[PDB]
Structure 1
């Protein structure tokens, strides 16, 4: 109640917490790439639409907000 209730658990605690290694850190950073690479085709491909109707692309100061 004081020893068995504790000492047995102290082991179970560390035995549990020791061999529980879920994963790494930084996988999201790899995801940031495709998130931007996905934009690349989506950006140029979307701009091409505007390059069709107005037959041209927006100006720098005009920015992508024109899209």
Structure 2
């Protein structure tokens, strides 16, 4: 019902937010954060490597939690594209259907409302 569609839109909103914050990091610092620096690099200046041009206050106000209480996941370099930003969904596991499906930057349009789709 409403709950599941709201949860899905929340995941879309967060993944897009994070992807945009990651692009700002790249614009400043010439590279994306590594998997090991993590999404935390968006709020706190990382090490290994230390970025050259870190923005005061970071790149996002806070790290969102996914609709099922788990942290969003991140890989750089990604398996699915240059970076992977994703949630594993309601089942907290790879793959799955329904609310269990994995939502990521690579397939994000699929989980957006219909007006974002290309048919």
TM class, shorter-chain normalised? 0.5 to 0.7
Q: Superposition RMSD on alpha carbons, in Å?
A: 1.0
Query: Which consecutive unaligned segments of at least 5 residues does structure 1 have?
Result: 1-25
Match of 2:25 among 40, 45, 50: 50
Q: Cα deviation per residue 1:9-60 (whole Å; 9 max; x = unaligned)? A: xxxxxxxxxxxxxxxxx42121110101011221111110000111110011
Relative to the length of structure 2, the TM-score reads 0.33
In structure 2, runs of 5+ residues without a counterpart are 43-119
Larger helix proportion of the pair: 1
Aligned length in residues = 42
SS at match of 1:52: helix
C-alpha separation in 1, matches of 2:26 and 2:17:
14
Structure with larger Rg: 1
Tell me the distance in 1 between the aligned counterparts of 2:37 and 2:14.
19
Larger RCO, structures 1/2 (Cα 8 Å, 6+ apart):
2
